[PDB]
Design a protein around this ligand. Structure first.
Ligand SMILES: *[C@@H]1O[C@H](CO)[C@@H](O)[C@H](O[C@@H]2O[C@H](CO)[C@@H](O)[C@H](O)[C@H]2NC(C)=O)[C@H]1NC(C)=O
Ligand SMILES: *[C@@H]1O[C@H](CO)[C@@H](O[C@@H]2O[C@H](CO)[C@@H](O)[C@H](O)[C@H]2NC(C)=O)[C@H](O)[C@H]1NC(C)=O
Ligand SMILES: *[C@@H]1O[C@H](CO)[C@@H](O[C@@H]2O[C@H](CO)[C@@H](O)[C@H](O)[C@H]2NC(C)=O)[C@H](O)[C@H]1NC(C)=O
Ligand SMILES: *[C@@H]1O[C@H](CO)[C@@H](O[C@@H]2O[C@H](CO)[C@@H](O)[C@H](O)[C@H]2NC(C)=O)[C@H](O)[C@H]1NC(C)=O
Ligand SMILES: *[C@@H]1O[C@H](CO)[C@@H](O[C@@H]2O[C@H](CO)[C@@H](O)[C@H](O)[C@H]2NC(C)=O)[C@H](O)[C@H]1NC(C)=O
Ligand SMILES: *[C@@H]1O[C@H](CO)[C@@H](O[C@@H]2O[C@H](CO)[C@@H](O)[C@H](O)[C@H]2NC(C)=O)[C@H](O)[C@H]1NC(C)=O
Ligand SMILES: *[C@@H]1O[C@H](CO)[C@@H](O)[C@H](O)[C@H]1NC(C)=O
Ligand SMILES: *[C@@H]1O[C@H](CO)[C@@H](O)[C@H](O)[C@H]1NC(C)=O
Ligand SMILES: *[C@@H]1O[C@H](CO)[C@@H](O)[C@H](O)[C@H]1NC(C)=O
Ligand SMILES: *[C@@H]1O[C@H](CO)[C@@H](O)[C@H](O)[C@H]1NC(C)=O
Ligand SMILES: *[C@@H]1O[C@H](CO)[C@@H](O)[C@H](O)[C@H]1NC(C)=O
Lengths: 415, 77, 100, 49, 50, 40
């Protein structure tokens, strides 16, 4: 067998897009653009523009729904106490900083400064989001304050206080490590956490290509809108791409044909734009659903699912806000410095077979001990950490040893 | 009226365009609602953090996220 | 266009995953792979569902035989059945049909 | 109450698709085909392709 | 049509990745996520497109 | 909330009283002592 004798604390970052810009296009203003002849001809085609407007409006509402689903998950606005005694853990770079404008943190400022890159057109409008950036920052601040001050209690009912070291002892107990390992190694764990948090900002300060997904979404939307605008300078087989020239240089009865030729192409362009917008919106909705699940299951609790929140054994997670998305900082436990031992499945003593209650039998070469499965801490094999079942002639791999009886010395000396 | 100054609203029913209660938001120009200094839970989403409700007459306010709460944190409590 | 990863590379990945889970347990999914005898790993997995270790250790031969018999049955089921893949074929059909 | 006295080990199969064939089409070879007049006419339709 | 179909294929691939992560690299307590009964372990094999 | 008396049955011992930060002095009851005094 191999058993680890040390550990490391690792924090990692995950980026998720949740929202998308809300745009609106007026069908008749785009197709016709201040021409009564074009509008009267377009009246003949039924109700295509109403359908396009309905689709775009639905897409616009879905974005606010996504943001509300992801972020508005806390009933009250929690605050941290003015005195910060968290057992040596330093959260100064993720808590809100109120000297500077807005209530953003250091890392949120880095994220907002990193992601940087239209105008007023013929029928194009951009609608503002319902929640400003300050309100999203205030949600994230409330979530951080709650998870630092109360643990996972505020996600089920009312928040209940608990000292931070005791909370982290709970969290070690939840991954199969006893409370001894934390209280005897508090300073080292705090130092490792502080160093990892310090490395996060260095990693995402100099490097810029980390926020690839958000910029990818922004670029795709901008490119689609630019292509739609540029498609207005094509004649689609007509004599010109300008309606004024057609109207002036030709009388109506054979201007009808050119106007229809332009109208069909512009309708086709609008339809293809709306269809690709619908597909992209569906993809963004799936991403936002995943982000909401992660916030519910990893910030408001401790997760047992493998690799759902970081690599390793999940300890805890912290949220941060980005221009059009969310960032998760996952703190996990990683065993290290393994050593190599020999094992046995059971121990025969007095003709009976003994199995460990919660550990494994190991030996350093001569003597046998019982240890945890995730940290080396040997102990004497007594009758208080083993249980007996059957005789020792049926298990494959039995070795002989002695099991200590604590009551024998006390009821022999004092009889 | 979306993304337009409240100045040139009436130039381009006629009682819902006069300068009785005129408010310049970031989503546009709002006519017919009174701007209060309070904050409540959102009722009708107007935008950019501004909501509207009916309370007598129609009022427009800034959204409130929730109720403040400070947890009595201590290192042995 | 040809896929970037060929079939031999995917088979290598699958073989690596299988060897890692057979030899290490679930330890290689968190950090370095830590070796463990297979029977003790199966005892861990019985503890994981609410059954004690002695139940595994006192019935090891029977459990091994049942596992071997089930593995034997699965390949007979795959070979004898006319069409068990199903979905994998279905996708292919759709694409081809659209192209036609 | 009812309590089991024996057990069974069972192996079950699950099948999941992960990818599909990468296919590529180009307009000018499909729509017109080695023809200058057709491509010149198609250039009047913008940037669909 | 090709875009609409590719979306579904991507969803299936995401589900397969989740199963690979949570059932081959660990033991799962979610009911019926990996087989019928109490999950013990899982083994992967490759297929021509799956 | 359901308080109990601190005995050696609901606690476990490991280490000295120096490494841990917020140690509090108290007593841990031993269930064996009364019967060992009443039955030599
Ligand atoms: C707890 O009981 C021990 C012995 O019964 C006693 O020594 C402790 O008193 C003080 O504990 C301090 C530990 O932080 C130690 O530094 C100090 O020297 C010691 N005082 C004396 C006179 O020995 C008891 N602890 C408390 C808090 O009273
Ligand atoms: C476990 O690993 C830590 C490193 O994270 C070890 O602590 C280091 O020990 C060396 C040598 O004593 C010092 O030079 C470093 O400054 C220590 N690092 C920190 C962050 O304090 C620790 O000694 C290891 N534990 C064991 C038992 O070997
Ligand atoms: C938590 O870490 C921050 C740095 O990330 C510490 O702030 C520094 O404190 C030193 C000493 O007071 C100053 O010289 C630096 O200028 C500070 N840096 C910044 C960016 O403000 C902070 O002191 C740490 N917390 C505690 C309790 O020590
Ligand atoms: C295995 O561990 C045991 C217990 O720690 C070691 O036995 C001790 O060895 C030291 C050094 O020889 C003695 O001072 C102690 O009195 C021994 N304790 C006993 C016998 O209970 C043993 O040496 C270790 N074997 C190795 C490392 O090969
Ligand atoms: C473990 O202990 C058993 C029980 O003492 C050993 O079995 C005995 O071995 C002696 C020789 O050392 C024989 O004379 C006896 O006939 C054996 N049986 C009994 C019931 O005493 C056994 O040899 C020891 N070692 C191992 C590896 O099992
Ligand atoms: C539990 O079920 C197994 C599997 O059926 C039983 O083992 C079988 O026992 C019969 C009669 O002894 C044999 O004919 C079979 O060959 C055995 N099967 C295998 C795979 O070895 C076992 O007896 C049952 N345990 C009970 C009823 O207590
Ligand atoms: C024991 O395990 C170590 C890995 O930590 C390995 O390098 C060593 O070879 C092993 N001892 C053997 C195989 O005897
Ligand atoms: C382990 O394998 C060795 C062969 O190297 C064999 O001698 C021994 O009996 C085996 N032990 C068990 C418990 O299977
Ligand atoms: C129009 O609205 C903007 C935005 O508040 C304001 O700055 C400006 O003064 C207003 N008037 C004109 C004439 O632009
Ligand atoms: C709201 O308060 C501000 C001062 O903060 C004041 O200037 C403004 O007139 C007030 N609004 C109303 C409707 O009373
Ligand atoms: C709690 O903080 C106070 C003030 O710093 C300190 O005196 C006390 O020792 C601390 N208690 C614990 C258990 O850390």
């Amino acid at each position: 067998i191999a058993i680890p004798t040390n550990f490391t604390i690792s924090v990692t970052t995950e980026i998720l897009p949740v929202s998308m810009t809300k745009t609106s296009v007026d069908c008749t203003m785009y197709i016709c653009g201040d021409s009564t002849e074009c509008s009267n001809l377009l009246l003949q085609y039924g109700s295509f523009c109403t359908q396009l407007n309905r689709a775009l409006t639905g897409i616009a509402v879905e974005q606010d729904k996504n943001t509300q689903e992801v972020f508005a998950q806390v009933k009250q606005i929690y605050k941290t106490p003015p005195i910060k005694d968290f057992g040596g853990f330093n959260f100064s770079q993720i808590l809100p900083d109120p000297s500077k404008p807005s209530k953003r943190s250091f890392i949120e400022d880095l994220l907002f400064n990193k992601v940087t890159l239209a105008q007023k057109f013929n029928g194009l409008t951009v609608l503002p989001p319902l929640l400003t950036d300050e309100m999203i920052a205030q949600y994230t601040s409330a979530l951080l304050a709650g998870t630092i001050t109360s643990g996972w209690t505020f996600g089920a009912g009312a928040a209940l206080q608990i000292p931070f070291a005791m909370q982290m002892a709970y969290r070690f107990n939840g991954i199969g490590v006893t409370q001894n390992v934390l209280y005897e190694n508090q300073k080292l764990i705090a130092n490792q956490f502080n160093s990892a948090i310090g490395k996060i900002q260095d990693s995402l300060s100099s490097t810029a290509s980390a926020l690839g997904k958000l910029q990818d979404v922004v670029n795709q939307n901008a490119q689609a809108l630019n292509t739609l605008v540029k498609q207005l300078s094509s004649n689609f087989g007509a004599i010109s791409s300008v309606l004024n020239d057609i109207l002036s240089r030709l009388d109506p009865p054979e201007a009808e044909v050119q106007i229809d030729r332009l109208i069909t192409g512009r309708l086709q362009s609008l339809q293809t734009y709306v269809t690709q917008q619908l597909i992209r919106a569906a993809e963004i909705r799936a991403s936002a659903n995943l982000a909401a699940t992660k916030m519910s299951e990893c910030v408001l609790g401790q997760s047992k699912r493998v690799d759902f929140c970081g690599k390793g054994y999940h300890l805890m997670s912290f949220p941060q806000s980005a221009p059009h998305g969310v960032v998760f900082l996952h703190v996990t436990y990683v065993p290290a410095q393994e050593k190599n031992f020999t094992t046995a499945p059971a121990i025969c003593h007095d003709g009976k077979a003994h199995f460990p209650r919660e550990g494994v039998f190991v030996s350093n070469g001569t003597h046998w001990f019982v240890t945890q499965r995730n940290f080396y801490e040997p102990q004497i094999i007594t009758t208080d950490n083993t249980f007996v079942s059957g005789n020792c002639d049926v298990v494959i791999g039995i070795v002989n040893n002695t099991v200590y009886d604590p009551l024998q010395p006390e009821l022999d000396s004092f009889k | 009226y979306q993304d337009v100054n409240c100045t040139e609203v009436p130039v381009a029913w006629r009682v819902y365009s006069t300068g009785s209660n005129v408010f310049q938001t970031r989503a546009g120009c709002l006519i017919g609602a009174e701007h209060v200094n309070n904050s409540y839970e959102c009722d009708i989403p107007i935008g950019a953090g501004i909501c509207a409700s009916y309370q007598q007459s129609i009022i427009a306010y800034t959204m409130s996220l929730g109720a403040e709460n400070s947890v009595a944190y201590s290192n042995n409590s």
